[PDB]
């Protein structure tokens, strides 16, 4: 029980992330859009080796 | 009709979408191009179960 | 003739367009990489129909 | 040879390129950006005629 | 030792990469959306040649 809350609170000591402050959005669209591209360029890659 | 007029202010009350003030237009920039972006992955992977 | 000046100055008048003033470019960009996106988006379809 | 220089310097006097100035990488990126989704557009149009 | 110390040096002292300050974010999603576009771009003309 006591582990478990502790294991929570580490689980989210250890948990973190950080964008630019004033490119906030901007760095969220970067987070969004290239994981989205990345996908599909990875996606065509699969393609490509299909297609071969 | 009373009810219709609660239910359309109710309706309004339950709705609400919220983006970054500053990063306004990012904010919808990520709105738009990753919902396109997301439209084409998904598509894709139609393509790709299609090809398979 | 007249008319035809008329109509130009009414053409313009009903004519408008209006962005965000400090996410001009960023308007810009939607109204840019959104169209491009969307018209393959569509395209995609085209070739999704033409794949079924 | 005077000629050649008067040449380049009206080559320079002739080109001109201008973009935002706070957005301007976001003019860059509208710029690059754009380019590629609109050589992708073209790309899938060549695609679609031999589709078809 | 002292060499590759020195070559280390050479090496940080040979490496640079500047973007924009303001627009850092900005030119990090430039850097990142174009690269993907640009390798799908190369891809797709990839398809094309083997389509073709």
């Known amino acids: 029980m006591e582990?478990?809350?502790?294991?929570?609170?580490?689980?989210?000591?250890?948990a973190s992330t950080i964008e630019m402050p004033q490119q906030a959005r901007q760095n969220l669209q970067n987070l969004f859009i290239n994981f989205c591209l990345?996908?599909?360029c990875l996606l065509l890659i699969c393609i490509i080796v299909m297609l071969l």
């Open 3 to 14: 582990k478990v809350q502790y294991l929570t609170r580490s689980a989210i000591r250890r």
């Open 38 to 40: 990345i996908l599909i």
